Amino acid sequence: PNYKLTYFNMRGRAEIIRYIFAYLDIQYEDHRIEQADWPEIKSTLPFGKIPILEVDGLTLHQSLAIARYLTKNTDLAGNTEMEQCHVDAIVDTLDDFMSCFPWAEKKQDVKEQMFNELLTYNAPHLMQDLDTYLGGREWLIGMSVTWADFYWEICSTTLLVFKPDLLDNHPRLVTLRKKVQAIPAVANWIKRRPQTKL
Amino acid sequence: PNYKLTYFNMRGRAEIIRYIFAYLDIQYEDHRIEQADWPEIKSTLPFGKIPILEVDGLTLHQSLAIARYLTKNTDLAGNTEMEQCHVDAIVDTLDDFMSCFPWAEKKQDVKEQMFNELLTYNAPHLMQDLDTYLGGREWLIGMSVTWADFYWEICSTTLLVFKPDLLDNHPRLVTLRKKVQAIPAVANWIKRRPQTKL
Numbered sequence A, B: 001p002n003y004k005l006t007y008f009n010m011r012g013r014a015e016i017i018r019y020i021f022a023y024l025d026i027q028y029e030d031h032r033i034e035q036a037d038w039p040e041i042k043s044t045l046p047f048g049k050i051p052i053l054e055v056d057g058l059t060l061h062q063s064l065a066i067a068r069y070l071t072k073n074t075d076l077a078g079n080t081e082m083e084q085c086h087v088d089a090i091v092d093t094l095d096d097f098m099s100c101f102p103w104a105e106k107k108q109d110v111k112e113q114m115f116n117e118l119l120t121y122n123a124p125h126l127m128q129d130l131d132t133y134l135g136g137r138e139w140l141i142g143m144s145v146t147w148a149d150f151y152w153e154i155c156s157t158t159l160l161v162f163k164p165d166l167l168d169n170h171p172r173l174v175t176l177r178k179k180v181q182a183i184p185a186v187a188n189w190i191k192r193r194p195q196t197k198l
């Protein structure tokens, strides 16, 4: 079908969807809006948030709901219902953390303090839990790559911008990142995608 | 299989799982732990959070990941691939808001202030979007109840404790709550479950 992804000109929450389209070799319109155009767009969306994915004109929302929709019946989903649950759980654990950052905090005072606290205190704890969860395994779930591995690489890439030494004590997590980045379709997207901070 | 759900003695994040077990008429061990017994259990979990659901000796985590797992191949999941996406999206939209509340706040005074601001300044926009989304339909997604309807009833039940007039401008959302509460299996669970504040 005809796919149209709408988001800001950032990797952000739309990147997981972009990785899936690239991996599955699916053509889509990568619509990146300008902040000045958001207000009008927002008023037309059922829940006023992006990303959204239009499939033949029908609008879908929530980045992870869309990602799950696109990976169902593909080799990125998980090989059993239980493994699919593990994929979803890891994705939500990562998303829970990313969602904790108060980008909308009214007071720039508290906002700055919270970011530093999450990066210096919480981040290291999560990295340790993920490292232990992965153990000596090749991928986070099963014996093959899943979109949970994609989300790990995506989330860690942005966190590394704020805290470069995040994975100094976890080489196995770095290796996993490199494995995802080395996947042909993914590597090709990473090299051609717009270069943005977030 | 044999199911063992572990959570605190409260509805909270485990309630969606409990509703699903009730609706599907599935037996399970509803393990409710006292605060004092949490520390020693927490240290044994990969990510140190509850609820967790043990299925034939294997542990699953993340409430919504578990809920999705339990509804797969059942009438609660959504009738089409697209509708299953909408179910996931509505659930995440609700969970996104619930996750905004600062339960970790130290000052009880400040904590209540933040809760009241979220319920007064932010909740109204979400309630309006949900009402508009529902329109004059019987259920949020499709023509039959889904676990998204369950989650709406569960989330709104607790929010109403803090903001009694939350739905005074949205009778259609109240009607939906009543419909969920009237389903025999669900009604039975609501009447027999332990009475807790949250």
Ligand SMILES: c1ccc(C(OC2CCN(CCCc3nnn[nH]3)CC2)c2ccccc2)cc1
Pocket: A010, A011, A012, A013, A095, A097, A098, A099, A101, A103, A154, A155, A158, A159, A198
């Ligand atoms: C997966 C999930 C979430 C993220 C986060 O980045 C998103 C949401 C925040 N967004 C903020 C830019 C705000 C802004 N205002 N003016 N200029 N820039 C960018 C995209 C996220 C969460 C935690 C730490 C960093 C980034 C990324 C991936």
Ligand SMILES: c1ccc(C(OC2CCN(CCCc3nnn[nH]3)CC2)c2ccccc2)cc1
Pocket: B010, B011, B012, B013, B095, B097, B098, B099, B101, B103, B154, B155, B158, B159, B198
């Ligand atoms: C679905 C999603 C999230 C919730 C929230 O309730 C949880 C979060 C924190 N938990 C803290 C209680 C600690 C405590 N111990 N003894 N007394 N108090 C209770 C359950 C939630 C989020 C937003 C508003 C209200 C409730 C419920 C359902």
Ligand SMILES: N[C@@H](CCC(=O)N[C@@H](CS)C(=O)NCC(=O)O)C(=O)O
Pocket: A012, A013, A042, A048, A049, A050, A051, A061, A062, A063, A064, B092, B096
């Ligand atoms: N959990 C949702 C988050 C949706 C969200 O908050 N999107 C932000 C951009 S990253 C947005 O639309 N904010 C603009 C606004 O709230 O006005 C997802 O993963 O899609």
Ligand SMILES: N[C@@H](CCC(=O)N[C@@H](CS)C(=O)NCC(=O)O)C(=O)O
Pocket: A092, A096, B012, B013, B042, B048, B049, B050, B051, B061, B062, B063, B064
């Ligand atoms: N998004 C996760 C949240 C998990 C979570 O934060 N659980 C809380 C209880 S509601 C917990 O384990 N907190 C106790 C602690 O962190 O020690 C879910 O839905 O399962």
Ligand SMILES: [Mg+2]
Pocket: A092, A095, A096, B092, B095, B096
């Ligand atoms: Mg979430």
